[PDB]
Scaffold this active site. Structure first.
Site, PDB file in Angstrom:
ATOM      1  N   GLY A 170      17.234  -8.228  -5.694  1.00 32.94           N
ATOM      2  CA  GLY A 170      16.395  -9.078  -5.893  1.00 32.94           C
ATOM      3  C   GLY A 170      16.654 -10.437  -6.380  1.00 32.94           C
ATOM      4  O   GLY A 170      17.462 -10.626  -7.276  1.00 32.94           O
ATOM      5  N   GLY A 179      26.563  -9.777 -15.309  1.00 33.55           N
ATOM      6  CA  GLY A 179      25.279  -9.321 -15.191  1.00 33.55           C
ATOM      7  C   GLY A 179      24.443  -9.750 -14.076  1.00 33.55           C
ATOM      8  O   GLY A 179      23.206  -9.306 -14.096  1.00 33.55           O
ATOM      9  N   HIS A 219      13.091  -1.115 -10.053  1.00 31.81           N
ATOM     10  CA  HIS A 219      13.486  -0.009 -11.049  1.00 31.81           C
ATOM     11  C   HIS A 219      12.319   0.703 -11.398  1.00 31.81           C
ATOM     12  O   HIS A 219      12.629   1.673 -12.085  1.00 31.81           O
ATOM     13  CB  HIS A 219      14.323  -0.701 -12.240  1.00 31.81           C
ATOM     14  CG  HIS A 219      15.476  -1.082 -11.647  1.00 31.81           C
ATOM     15  ND1 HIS A 219      16.549  -0.345 -11.577  1.00 31.81           N
ATOM     16  CD2 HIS A 219      15.963  -2.463 -11.558  1.00 31.81           C
ATOM     17  CE1 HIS A 219      17.879  -1.005 -11.089  1.00 31.81           C
ATOM     18  NE2 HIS A 219      17.470  -2.345 -11.199  1.00 31.81           N
ATOM     19  N   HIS A 242      14.628 -32.182 -22.139  1.00 29.83           N
ATOM     20  CA  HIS A 242      16.150 -32.705 -21.498  1.00 29.83           C
ATOM     21  C   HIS A 242      16.033 -32.532 -20.044  1.00 29.83           C
ATOM     22  O   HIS A 242      16.750 -33.606 -19.346  1.00 29.83           O
ATOM     23  CB  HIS A 242      17.040 -31.521 -22.256  1.00 29.83           C
ATOM     24  CG  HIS A 242      18.397 -31.848 -21.760  1.00 29.83           C
ATOM     25  ND1 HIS A 242      19.409 -32.270 -22.765  1.00 29.83           N
ATOM     26  CD2 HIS A 242      19.078 -31.640 -20.582  1.00 29.83           C
ATOM     27  CE1 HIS A 242      20.546 -32.526 -22.058  1.00 29.83           C
ATOM     28  NE2 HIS A 242      20.554 -32.059 -20.684  1.00 29.83           N
ATOM     29  N   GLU A 243      15.495 -31.665 -19.549  1.00 27.80           N
ATOM     30  CA  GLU A 243      15.359 -31.718 -17.880  1.00 27.80           C
ATOM     31  C   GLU A 243      14.597 -32.854 -17.367  1.00 27.80           C
ATOM     32  O   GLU A 243      15.231 -33.553 -16.388  1.00 27.80           O
ATOM     33  CB  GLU A 243      15.071 -30.464 -17.352  1.00 27.80           C
ATOM     34  CG  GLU A 243      15.775 -29.155 -17.780  1.00 27.80           C
ATOM     35  CD  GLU A 243      17.337 -29.331 -17.663  1.00 27.80           C
ATOM     36  OE1 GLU A 243      17.738 -29.696 -16.287  1.00 27.80           O
ATOM     37  OE2 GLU A 243      18.058 -28.949 -18.177  1.00 27.80           O
ATOM     38  N   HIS A 288      16.367 -36.313 -17.161  1.00 22.69           N
ATOM     39  CA  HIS A 288      17.224 -36.703 -15.949  1.00 22.69           C
ATOM     40  C   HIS A 288      16.319 -37.176 -14.848  1.00 22.69           C
ATOM     41  O   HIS A 288      16.909 -37.936 -14.214  1.00 22.69           O
ATOM     42  CB  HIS A 288      18.027 -35.190 -15.708  1.00 22.69           C
ATOM     43  CG  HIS A 288      19.209 -34.989 -16.534  1.00 22.69           C
ATOM     44  ND1 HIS A 288      20.379 -35.979 -16.564  1.00 22.69           N
ATOM     45  CD2 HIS A 288      19.695 -34.089 -17.202  1.00 22.69           C
ATOM     46  CE1 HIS A 288      21.293 -35.529 -17.316  1.00 22.69           C
ATOM     47  NE2 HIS A 288      20.919 -34.317 -17.730  1.00 22.69           N
TER      48      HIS A 288
HETATM   49  N1  LIG Z   1      19.437  -8.669  -8.536  1.00 16.72           N
HETATM   50  C1  LIG Z   1      19.604  -7.653  -9.102  1.00 16.72           C
HETATM   51  N2  LIG Z   1      18.446  -6.734  -8.707  1.00 16.72           N
HETATM   52  C2  LIG Z   1      18.571  -5.497  -9.154  1.00 16.72           C
HETATM   53  N3  LIG Z   1      19.384  -5.106  -9.885  1.00 16.72           N
HETATM   54  C3  LIG Z   1      20.198  -5.836 -10.439  1.00 16.72           C
HETATM   55  C4  LIG Z   1      20.620  -7.274 -10.171  1.00 16.72           C
HETATM   56  N4  LIG Z   1      21.679  -8.005 -10.696  1.00 16.72           N
HETATM   57  C5  LIG Z   1      21.943  -6.794 -11.585  1.00 16.72           C
HETATM   58  N5  LIG Z   1      21.356  -5.804 -11.341  1.00 16.72           N
HETATM   59  C6  LIG Z   1      21.648  -4.454 -12.157  1.00 16.72           C
HETATM   60  O1  LIG Z   1      22.711  -4.931 -13.028  1.00 16.72           O
HETATM   61  C7  LIG Z   1      23.450  -3.489 -13.179  1.00 16.72           C
HETATM   62  C8  LIG Z   1      25.003  -4.034 -13.492  1.00 16.72           C
HETATM   63  O2  LIG Z   1      25.087  -5.446 -12.897  1.00 16.72           O
HETATM   64  P1  LIG Z   1      26.339  -5.570 -11.973  1.00 16.72           P
HETATM   65  O3  LIG Z   1      27.734  -4.809 -12.414  1.00 16.72           O
HETATM   66  O4  LIG Z   1      26.189  -5.497 -10.650  1.00 16.72           O
HETATM   67  O5  LIG Z   1      26.698  -7.492 -12.270  1.00 16.72           O
HETATM   68  P2  LIG Z   1      28.057  -8.145 -12.381  1.00 16.72           P
HETATM   69  O6  LIG Z   1      27.756  -9.499 -12.115  1.00 16.72           O
HETATM   70  O7  LIG Z   1      29.293  -7.443 -11.346  1.00 16.72           O
HETATM   71  O8  LIG Z   1      28.567  -7.891 -13.802  1.00 16.72           O
HETATM   72  P3  LIG Z   1      29.779  -8.331 -14.584  1.00 16.72           P
HETATM   73  O9  LIG Z   1      30.096  -9.797 -14.930  1.00 16.72           O
HETATM   74  O10 LIG Z   1      29.459  -7.663 -16.150  1.00 16.72           O
HETATM   75  O11 LIG Z   1      31.034  -7.548 -14.020  1.00 16.72           O
HETATM   76  C9  LIG Z   1      23.681  -3.033 -11.646  1.00 16.72           C
HETATM   77  O12 LIG Z   1      23.881  -1.804 -12.068  1.00 16.72           O
HETATM   78  C10 LIG Z   1      22.171  -3.511 -11.139  1.00 16.72           C
HETATM   79  O13 LIG Z   1      21.245  -2.202 -11.530  1.00 16.72           O
HETATM   80 ZN   LIG Z   2      21.795 -32.896 -19.076  1.00 17.24          ZN
END
Ligand SMILES: Nc1ncnc2c1ncn2[C@@H]1O[C@H](COP(=O)(O)OP(=O)(O)OP(=O)(O)O)[C@@H](O)[C@H]1O
Ligand SMILES: [Zn+2]
Ligand SMILES: Nc1ncnc2c1ncn2[C@@H]1O[C@H](COP(=O)(O)OP(=O)(O)OP(=O)(O)O)[C@@H](O)[C@H]1O
Ligand SMILES: [Mg+2]
Ligand SMILES: [Mg+2]
Ligand SMILES: [Zn+2]
Lengths: 398, 398
Positions: free
Chosen positions: B9, B49, B169, B249-250, B253
């Site tokens: 998403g 994340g 989810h 701030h935004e 700019h």
């Molecule tokens: N856009 C998204 N839609 C749905 N679930 C998501 C989304 N982004 C993250 N998640 C949830 O986040 C959980 C963990 O994130 P993920 O490991 O894919 O991120 P990452 O960017 O690889 O993380 P890191 O930098 O910690 O390695 C995934 O199991 C998924 O459930």
């Molecule tokens: Zn700035």
């Protein structure tokens, strides 16, 4: 892969220069029988992506001879140079190519290269070639007689040059009937051969992503936007706003030269640089190019050298990087004039000469503003004026 | 577990970019028959994340092919890299994924990876992918042509993105009729996909602790408090007091850019960062992005870059971390300007340029205080302004 002169576009003068090398490599006895002595080394200079390596490879293609090459970016060093020249001698008619010679020309490798240059016989058909894009940092020992002493300049392409390069890279691809390569060339001022090659690949990926078997006009136009912006950009182009500032700067040089009595004749005006001076190279050559030194001809040269900077301030009130370079050259000429035509009092005299010459150029621009405007309008439409057309235009005006 | 694009998403642009990779993996002959050349490596960059690993796994789901992966945090090393590429070749249409490539890109493992990249044929449907959240410490040897050369950015979600992730989810869980996922999304600004996944689990534990078989609205609202405070906290959110400082701030700019003659057009204003520059990445790209260097356009760029810091001091008398970064970038641009447009005297000139540009921005803020206030009020209610609405708003004002 093998290439020839059919794979090069927009480098007519360089090909004309290299025709002699090709002829010599094909049959040395014709040169030997009349006592014609060939140079031992040739140097290619130009901006990155203009096709120096391509020209070096195409020279060997036209006259099919062995091609031994090394790269300066990979620099044990003295032993690798020794082996390269030993292979060439056993296959006497051949070429030795050194790429990026500025990366090596640490002191042991350079010494070995000078020993090899003096040790081989040119009468059996051996030539050495090199390329660089920073010619002004080379060691002076490489440019003495008997060593690299012939220079060839490679320039960015103009509109007709860009069209030829596009046709070379699309002759094995299927195109639709709405594709007009001439329109595409008019919308990419500032691109070099490397940029245009990448643009064709981008347009082919857009068509394949949809399953189509032909590239259409809109594929090419969308590919331009994708290569100039974003997290992954590769190319720069001149925008219409930037084009107007450049046009006024170039026209300022030509107008001032035509007005001063001792100015030089003008033969070509363009938006793309073409000369080695326009590219910012000195090539270890003296600035003074005249047999006689006189006051009147030196002052006229200074005034014309400041014509571009004077036009920017009078029309826009701005200054560019090119204008800053021009006033740096003028200060060196003024310093030499004081010591030839007659510590803190010398500086005051140099500053007075430059200031007076700058005021003179500004008053010429104001008086001929109408003529300056007319030239800019034509330049923004064709991008280049030369030949008989320029002669007629300069005669109707003034 | 198997995933596809239905499990992601708020990443529309990344999915649009990866559609081409999916199409290529499904049938390489369509790309080969017209001479379209695919990149050998792709790099994903974004904050932790955000779902880089999820996107990599979903690419293989859409086009069902073998998926061979390794992790850089587990680094004998050179032998493990050799085995990974041997499996992919025996199953030509497949993917090789390297996670956390910054942990390894000790010198023997890196050398083996470069040998493998140059040794496989891309025409049979092999692609290499990697991910990282510290792109600016990568070895430059990995970014040369023929290696990882395509970059894709992954961004934190906005309000409508957060709502979509919540629905993904909760599709296998029973919900009551008083649950409004749109209200929940409005109360979690700053959350990422990983945070929202943990929030849904917390609300389900509160319902099960009482024996209920449905999750109610008050379960969700109590779960928010439990994940932002205490000995076991996982997430951070933007409070209403912090939201006002960010909004000013935004807007600072955007107001300054619209006033200076050489400023750039504004297309989007938001509380959540969206660009790679807004995330603090350089990506090994030159700062200068223009063909022509001129004084007037450089000064206008400097003044707009200090608009955010000027608004904070005039309205609140405070300074944030984002403002400190902005003035650090401005000093690098000023240093380059002095050396291009004309040791201790150079520093005094750089300090003078920055100080003058900062005073200019402060006097623009004071004159347009009424317009600045109106934009902030709308921003605090919708969190994002773009499209035709922004064009109309900027036209009614000013
Ligand atoms: N856009 C998204 N839609 C749905 N679930 C998501 C989304 N982004 C993250 N998640 C949830 O986040 C959980 C963990 O994130 P993920 O490991 O894919 O991120 P990452 O960017 O690889 O993380 P890191 O930098 O910690 O390695 C995934 O199991 C998924 O459930
Ligand atoms: Zn700035
Ligand atoms: N005039 C040209 N006609 C056709 N293709 C060209 C031309 N100039 C450059 N190219 C393309 O550019 C590609 C790369 O450029 P090339 O390496 O020959 O340039 P260069 O001047 O040696 O570069 P650099 O300074 O980066 O070493 C070549 O493969 C060729 O496809
Ligand atoms: Mg080269
Ligand atoms: Mg991960
Ligand atoms: Zn000039």
């Amino acid at each position: 892969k093998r290439v020839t002169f059919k794979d090069v576009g927009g480098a007519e003068e360089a090909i004309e220069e290299l025709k002699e090398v090709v002829e010599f490599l094909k049959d040395p006895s014709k040169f030997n029988r009349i006592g014609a002595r060939m140079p031992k080394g040739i140097l290619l200079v130009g901006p990155p992506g203009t096709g120096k390596t391509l020209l070096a490879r195409a020279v060997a293609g036209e006259a099919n001879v062995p091609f031994f090459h090394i790269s300066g970016s990979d620099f044990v060093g003295a032993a690798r140079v020794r082996d390269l020249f030993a292979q060439a001698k056993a296959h006497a008619p051949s070429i030795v190519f050194i790429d990026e010679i500025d990366a090596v020309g640490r002191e042991q490798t350079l010494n070995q290269l000078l020993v090899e240059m003096d040790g081989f016989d040119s009468k059996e058909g051996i030539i050495v070639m090199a390329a660089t894009n920073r010619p002004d940092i080379l060691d002076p020992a490489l440019l003495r007689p008997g060593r690299f002493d012939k220079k060839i300049v490679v320039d960015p392409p103009d509109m007709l040059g860009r069209k030829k390069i596009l046709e070379i890279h699309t002759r094995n691809k299927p195109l639709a009937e709405d594709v007009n390569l001439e329109i595409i060339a008019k919308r990419t001022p500032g691109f070099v051969g490397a940029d245009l090659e990448n643009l064709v690949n981008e347009a082919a990926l857009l068509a394949a992503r949809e399953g189509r078997d032909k590239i259409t006009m809109k594929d090419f136009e969308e590919a331009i936007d994708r290569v100039i912006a974003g997290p992954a950009r590769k190319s720069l182009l001149i925008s219409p706003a930037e084009k107007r500032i450049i046009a006024y700067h170039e026209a300022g040089h030509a107008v001032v030269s035509t007005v001063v009595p001792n100015g030089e004749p003008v033969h070509r005006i363009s938006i793309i640089p073409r000369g080695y001076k326009a590219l910012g190279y000195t090539l270890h050559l003296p600035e003074e190019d005249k047999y006689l030194v006189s006051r009147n001809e030196l002052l006229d040269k200074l005034t014309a050298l400041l014509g571009g900077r004077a036009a920017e301030e009078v029309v826009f009130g701005d200054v560019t990087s090119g204008a800053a370079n021009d006033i740096e050259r003028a200060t060196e000429i003024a310093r030499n004039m004081v010591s030839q035509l007659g510590a803190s009092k010398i500086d005051e005299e140099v500053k007075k000469i430059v200031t007076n010459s700058y005021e003179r150029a500004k008053e010429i621009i104001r008086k001929y503003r109408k003529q300056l405007d007319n030239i800019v309008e034509i330049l923004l439409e064709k991008e280049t004026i030369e030949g008989d057309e320029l002669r007629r235009i300069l005669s109707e005006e003034f």
